[PDB]
Amino acid sequence: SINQKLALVIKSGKYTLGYKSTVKSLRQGKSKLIIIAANTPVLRKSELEYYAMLSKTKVYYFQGGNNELGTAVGKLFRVGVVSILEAGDSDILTTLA
Amino acid sequence: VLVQDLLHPTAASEARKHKLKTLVQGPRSYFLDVKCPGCLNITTVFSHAQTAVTCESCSTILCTPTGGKAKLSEGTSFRRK
Amino acid sequence: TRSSVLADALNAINNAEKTGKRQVLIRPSSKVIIKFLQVMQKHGYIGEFEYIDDHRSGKIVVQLNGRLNKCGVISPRFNVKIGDIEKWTANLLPARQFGYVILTTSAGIMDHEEARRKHVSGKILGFVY
Amino acid sequence: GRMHSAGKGISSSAIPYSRNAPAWFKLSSESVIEQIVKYARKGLTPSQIGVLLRDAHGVTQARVITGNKIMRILKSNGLAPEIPEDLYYLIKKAVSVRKHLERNRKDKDAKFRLILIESRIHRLARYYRTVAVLPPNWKYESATASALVN
Amino acid sequence: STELTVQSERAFQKQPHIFNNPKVKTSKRTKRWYKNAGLGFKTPKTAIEGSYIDKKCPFTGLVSIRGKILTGTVVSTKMHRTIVIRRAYLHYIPKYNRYEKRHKNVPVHVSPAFRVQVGDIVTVGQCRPISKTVRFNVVKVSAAAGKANKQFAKF
Amino acid sequence: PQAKILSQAPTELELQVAQAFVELENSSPELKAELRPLQFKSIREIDVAGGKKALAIFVPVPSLAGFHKVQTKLTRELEKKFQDRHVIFLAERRILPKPSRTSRQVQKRPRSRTLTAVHDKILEDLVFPTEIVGKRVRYLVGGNKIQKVLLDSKDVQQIDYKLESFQAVYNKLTGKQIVFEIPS
Ligand SMILES: [Mg+2]
Ligand SMILES: [Mg+2]
C-alpha cells in the first residue's frame, strides 16, 4: 500500500533520492514529504527531522532500511532518504503515510 | 423420462439450475438504482458489488461486500435496473 | 481436456440411444458435428436436430428414432486411400448391404458409398449403422 | 482444471447473451473511456478498472459498451505497462514467497508452492514471448524479479 | 558488401576474366558482372551493384543452380558465407499407419548479397560440390516482418 | 435538398421518399443534428405473401447510431404517408468472399466482412426496436435448414404485424428460410 503510493509517485510525480539532494530540497522549501529508511544513522535522521521541522515538511519513516527504499522507489541501489518534490496521481501527501 | 423436451424446458426447471448449466448460460446478477439518504442522485450499483460503493453525500458506505450479493446499507432506497 | 468434440458428440448419442432416449443434448456443437449429423439424418439414422445458438459455441439437440445401432468415431483421422476404403468398411461395418463409413474429403464430408461414386478419398471420421 | 492442483471447480462468470447492453445505460461510450483512463492514471490495473466500473457505474462490460476491451483501451491511450497484469501478479507472488522463504528456510510447503508459482511464470512468459507481448530473451531470473515489481 | 574489407586477404579478390580498363575511363570505376539465376529467382539488387566477389555466388560467381530446389530453416550462421538449414519432414511407417517427425541438416553456402538470420526460411538451389558437405546455394530468403516489431520499450 | 439526400441519380421510387423526408422537417427544434445530415444509398421493393409491399432502404453504416435515434419516430409517419408498404432500415455492409487456395493474397478479411456476420447484422438491423434474445437453427429431415429468431417481449407492438414482411425480405436478400417467435 505504502509501496504502491511510492511507486505512483515515481511514475507520475517528482522526487529526489539521497541525503544531499533531500537537504537541498528542504533548504529550498520545495519538499512536501521526506521518507527516511530504518537503518539510516540516528544522527543523520535527527538532522533530517530538524530540517523538516525547520521547513514544515512531513516526515515518514519507512519500515525497512535503505535496501528496501531503493527497491520501493524502483532503483537498484540503496536509498537512505527520498524527498517527494511534487506528488503525481497518488495521494501520498493527503494520506498521513 | 425416455422422452423429454430439451429445447423447451420449464421456467421452474430453468430457474433452479446453475447459471452455467441452463439451456443458454447467462447471469442471475443484476443492477440497482440506489438513493442514499444524503442526497437524491441515482447511483447504479452491482448486486454482487464486492466493493464499498460510495456516494458524494454519504461517502462512507452504500453497500458492503460479502461472499455473494452485496449488503445494502440498511437505509438506502433501491430499485432494480 | 476436450480433444475431439465429434467424439464427445457421438458418445453422447450412443449413450442416449443405448438407454433408449429419444433426444440428446450435445456440446459444443462443431460444424464437423453438424455435417456428420446431416449425413446421419440423410440416411435416416436420426431425425430432426436443432442447433441452439448461444454466443460461445452452440448446442445441438438431436431427435433419435430408436434406429441407430452404433455411431462411432475413428481417432486419429487416418489418411485412407481409394483402395483402403474396402478394408475399413469390412472392418467397421456389420455387413456389406448397410452401414456407412464417413470420410472427411476435400469434396466434402460424405460417407464411403457416395465417396466411391464420386471417386474421392480423404481422411476417415467415423461410421454409422 | 487447476493446472497445479486437483481442484475441479467451475466458479466462473457467465456474461450475457446480449451483445448490446443494457438498454438503461445513459452514459456515453466516450465518457466511460475517460473514466477508464482516469482510473488507469490512478495506477489501477485493467481488472480493477473493470471491477470498479461495474460497481460504481453501470458498466456491464467495456467491450459491449465501447468497441474494445480495457487493456486495448489503455494501449491506444499509452498507459499499457511493460508487463501484463497476470504475469506481474505472479512475479510479485513469487517475490513475496521468497521473502517469506529466507525468513523461514524450512518451509518446505512454501518451497513446493514457489516451484509451482515459478513454473506458472515460465509458462506464461513463454506464451508472451511467442506472441511478442514480451520481448525475446525476457527471462524471469528469481533474483532480478524484484526489479520488475518495484 | 560494398565496404568492410572487400580485399581482406593475401590475394586480390576480383571476378575472373572481367577486365577493368585503365585507359577508357567511365563514371562508375567498377565494372561488375552478374547473371540471371533462372527458375524465376530474382537476382538481388545487392548482388547487382555490390562490391563483394564470392566466386560461389549464384548471381555473380561461377556456379550454376541446377538440380533440386529445397526449403529449410536456418539454425546456424556461425560459418563464413555458409549456413546450416534444418529441413523437418514426416516419415511414414506402414505397420502402425502413422508418421514420425524427422529432420535433416543441410549445409548451404550463402552469398553476402543475402542477410540470413537464425529462424529465417530460405530456399536453396542445388549446385556443384562447393565444399566437403555443401551442395546448395541460397537463392531467395523469405522474411517480410519476422515478428520483431512489438518487442521493445513501452511508455 | 431533394437529390442531395440520395447520392445517386436514379430513381423516382426513392426521389419521392427523398422529398418526403424534406416535407417531414417541420420540427425545427429536432431537425438539427437529428434528421438533417442523414442520407441513404438505395431502395429495394419486396412483395410479401400477404399482397403488400415492403421498402428495404440502405444506409451506408457509418451512421446507424444517429439514424436509429430517429428510426422509431420516422417509421411512423413514413408509414402513414406510404401505406401498403413496410419500411425497413438496413445497412449496406460489404461482403467479401473467403480466399481460395490459388487466390492472390488480398488484405486479411475482417470478421465484419464475412458473409455470416453481414447476415447476422442484417437480421439485427431488420428487427431494430426489439432485441434478439436467442437463435435456433432447425435442420429438417429433408435437408431444409430453418432459422428461428427469438425476440424480446418488451416493445413488440411496433413490429408484431411485420414478421411476415421481415421474413420475406430476409428470404429475398439472404436466401435463407427463417421464422420468428416471441417467448412468453
Ligand atoms: Mg472442468
Ligand atoms: Mg499438468
Swiss-Prot record, chain A:
Cross-link (Glycyl lysine isopeptide (Lys-Gly) (interchain with G-Cter in ubiquitin)) at residue(s): 14, 45, 75
Supply the alphabetized keyword list: Cytoplasm, Isopeptide bond, Ribonucleoprotein, Ribosomal protein, Ubl conjugation
Q: Where in the cell is it found?
A: Cytoplasm
First-listed, main subcellular location of the protein, grouped into a coarse class: cytoplasm
The molecular function terms in GO held by this entry are: pre-mRNA 5'-splice site binding; RNA binding; structural constituent of ribosome
Q: Which PROSITE patterns match?
A: RIBOSOMAL_L30E_1, RIBOSOMAL_L30E_2
Which GO BP terms sit in this record? Answer: cytoplasmic translation; negative regulation of mRNA splicing, via spliceosome; rRNA processing
Its GO CC terms are: cytoplasm; cytosol; cytosolic large ribosomal subunit
Disulfide links within the chain: none
Subunit details: Component of the large ribosomal subunit (LSU). Mature yeast ribosomes consist of a small (40S) and a large (60S) subunit. The 40S small subunit contains 1 molecule of ribosomal RNA (18S rRNA) and 33 different proteins (encoded by 57 genes). The large 60S subunit contains 3 rRNA molecules (25S, 5.8S and 5S rRNA) and 46 different proteins (encoded by 81 genes).
Job of this protein: Component of the ribosome, a large ribonucleoprotein complex responsible for the synthesis of proteins in the cell. The small ribosomal subunit (SSU) binds messenger RNAs (mRNAs) and translates the encoded message by selecting cognate aminoacyl-transfer RNA (tRNA) molecules. The large subunit (LSU) contains the ribosomal catalytic site termed the peptidyl transferase center (PTC), which catalyzes the formation of peptide bonds, thereby polymerizing the amino acids delivered by tRNAs into a polypeptide chain.
From Swiss-Prot, chain B:
One GO CC term, this protein:
cytosol
Instruction: Report the locations given in the UniProt record.
Output: Cytoplasm
- Pfam families, per this entry? Ribosomal_S27e (PF01667)
Q: What is a single molecular function from GO for this protein?
A: zinc ion binding
Q: Which residue stretches, if any, does this entry annotate as coiled coil?
A: none
Keywords associated with the record: Cytoplasm, Metal-binding, Methylation, Ribonucleoprotein, Ribosomal protein, Zinc, Zinc-finger
Give TM regions.
none
Q: What are the GO BP annotations of this UniProt entry?
A: maturation of SSU-rRNA from tricistronic rRNA transcript (SSU-rRNA, 5.8S rRNA, LSU-rRNA); ribosomal small subunit assembly; translation
- Mark the C4-type zinc finger spans by residue number: 36-58
Q: Which domain of life is it from?
A: Eukaryota
The record, for InterPro entries, names: Ribosomal_eS27 (IPR000592), Ribosomal_eS27_Zn-bd_dom_sf (IPR023407), Ribosomal_zn-bd (IPR011332)
Report the principal subcellular site. Answer: cytoplasm
| Keyword Zinc-finger set for record | yes
What are the required cofactors?
Zn(2+)
Q: Which residues carry this modification: S-methylcysteine?
A: 39
Q: How is it modified after translation?
A: The N-terminus is not modified.
Biological role stated in the UniProt entry: Component of the ribosome, a large ribonucleoprotein complex responsible for the synthesis of proteins in the cell. The small ribosomal subunit (SSU) binds messenger RNAs (mRNAs) and translates the encoded message by selecting cognate aminoacyl-transfer RNA (tRNA) molecules. The large subunit (LSU) contains the ribosomal catalytic site termed the peptidyl transferase center (PTC), which catalyzes the formation of peptide bonds, thereby polymerizing the amino acids delivered by tRNAs into a polypeptide chain.
Q: Belongs to which family?
A: Belongs to the eukaryotic ribosomal protein eS27 family.
Extra facts:
Present with 43300 molecules/cell in log phase SD medium. There are 2 genes for eS27 in yeast.
**Protein's name according to its UniProt entry:** Small ribosomal subunit protein eS27A
Species annotation: Saccharomyces cerevisiae (strain ATCC 204508 / S288c) (Baker's yeast)
Swiss-Prot record, chain D:
Q: What is the annotated role of this protein in its UniProt record?
A: Component of the ribosome, a large ribonucleoprotein complex responsible for the synthesis of proteins in the cell. The small ribosomal subunit (SSU) binds messenger RNAs (mRNAs) and translates the encoded message by selecting cognate aminoacyl-transfer RNA (tRNA) molecules. The large subunit (LSU) contains the ribosomal catalytic site termed the peptidyl transferase center (PTC), which catalyzes the formation of peptide bonds, thereby polymerizing the amino acids delivered by tRNAs into a polypeptide chain.
Q: Name one GO biological process term.
A: maturation of SSU-rRNA from tricistronic rRNA transcript (SSU-rRNA, 5.8S rRNA, LSU-rRNA)
Name of the protein in its database record: Small ribosomal subunit protein uS15
Q: Per its UniProt record, what NCBIfam families does this chain match?
A: PRK08561.1 (NF006331)
Q: Where would you say this protein principally sits, based on its record?
A: cytoplasm
What family is this?
Answer: Belongs to the universal ribosomal protein uS15 family.
The residues joined by the cross-link Glycyl lysine isopeptide (Lys-Gly) (interchain with G-Cter in ubiquitin) are 38, 42
What taxonomic lineage is listed for the species of origin?
A: Eukaryota, Fungi, Dikarya, Ascomycota, Saccharomycotina
Concerning InterPro entries, the annotation shows: Ribosomal_uS15, Ribosomal_uS15_arc_euk, Ribosomal_uS15_N, uS15_NS1_RNA-bd_sf
Please name the source species.
Saccharomyces cerevisiae (strain ATCC 204508 / S288c)
Q: Does the keyword Zinc-finger apply?
A: no
Q: Name one GO cellular component term.
A: cytosolic small ribosomal subunit
Q: Where in the cell is it found?
A: Cytoplasm
Q: Which residues carry this modification: Phosphoserine?
A: 31
Record's keyword terms, sorted: Cytoplasm, Isopeptide bond, Phosphoprotein, Ribonucleoprotein, Ribosomal protein, Ubl conjugation
Q: Which domain of life is it from?
A: Eukaryota
Which GO molecular-function terms appear in the entry? small ribosomal subunit rRNA binding; structural constituent of ribosome
From Swiss-Prot, chain E:
**Gene3D superfamilies noted in UniProt:** 2.40.50.1000
Give GO BP annotations, semicolon-separated. Answer: maturation of SSU-rRNA from tricistronic rRNA transcript (SSU-rRNA, 5.8S rRNA, LSU-rRNA); ribosomal small subunit assembly; translation
Instruction: Cite any additional comment in the entry.
Output: There are 2 genes for uS17 in yeast.
Tell me the subunit arrangement. Component of the small ribosomal subunit (SSU). Mature yeast ribosomes consist of a small (40S) and a large (60S) subunit. The 40S small subunit contains 1 molecule of ribosomal RNA (18S rRNA) and 33 different proteins (encoded by 57 genes). The large 60S subunit contains 3 rRNA molecules (25S, 5.8S and 5S rRNA) and 46 different proteins (encoded by 81 genes).
Described purpose of this protein according to its UniProt entry: Component of the ribosome, a large ribonucleoprotein complex responsible for the synthesis of proteins in the cell. The small ribosomal subunit (SSU) binds messenger RNAs (mRNAs) and translates the encoded message by selecting cognate aminoacyl-transfer RNA (tRNA) molecules. The large subunit (LSU) contains the ribosomal catalytic site termed the peptidyl transferase center (PTC), which catalyzes the formation of peptide bonds, thereby polymerizing the amino acids delivered by tRNAs into a polypeptide chain.
Coarse class of the protein's main subcellular location:
cytoplasm
Where's it found, cell-wise?
A: Cytoplasm
Q: List the Pfam families.
A: Ribosomal_S17 (PF00366), Ribosomal_S17_N (PF16205)
By what name is this protein known? Small ribosomal subunit protein uS17A
| Location in chain, cross-link Glycyl lysine isopeptide (Lys-Gly) (interchain with G-Cter in ubiquitin) | 14, 45, 55-56, 78, 95, 104, 132, 140, 147
Where are residues bearing N-acetylserine located in the sequence?
Answer: 1
Carries keyword Ribonucleoprotein?
yes
Q: Which domain of life is it from?
A: Eukaryota
Task: Tell me a Gene Ontology molecular-function term this record carries.
Answer: rRNA binding
Q: Which CDD domains match?
A: Ribosomal_uS17
